[PDB]
Design a protein around this nucleic acid. Structure first.
Ligand SMILES: [Zn+2]
Ligand SMILES: [Zn+2]
Ligand SMILES: [Zn+2]
Ligand SMILES: [Zn+2]
Ligand SMILES: [Zn+2]
Ligand SMILES: [Zn+2]
Ligand SMILES: [Zn+2]
Ligand SMILES: [Zn+2]
Lengths: 37, 46
DNA sequence: GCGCGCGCGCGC
DNA sequence: GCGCGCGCGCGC
């Protein structure tokens, strides 16, 4: 997967990676706050 | 009349091409005569 | 071809 | 009824 949040960011259900319990490795988000390592 | 470039890139749902509100022609109830769209699905005619 | 940004639409 | 991620037309 690969989100585009930020143009709580990536820290909620509206973000795929968060929801799927994955990190934003390779994502195109901005100001990512996904705590997933 | 407007001139859309709908559908040029590859990655795009080909069944909604010139058949939704993002198309100026479709939205303005125009045909795509003179347009440069690829895979036009516009149901209007004049 | 790429990136910007608009606006659709779903999930709450 | 709202909010924002995402699909894609458009300027360049
Ligand atoms: Zn995200
Ligand atoms: Zn992500
Ligand atoms: Zn993120
Ligand atoms: Zn069109
Ligand atoms: Zn057209
Ligand atoms: Zn068309
Ligand atoms: Zn469904
Ligand atoms: Zn279903």
């Amino acid at each position: 997967p690969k989100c585009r949040c930020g143009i709580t960011t990536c820290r909620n259900s509206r973000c795929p990676c968060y929801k799927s319990y994955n990190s934003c490795a390779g994502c195109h988000c901005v100001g990512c706050k996904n705590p997933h390592k």
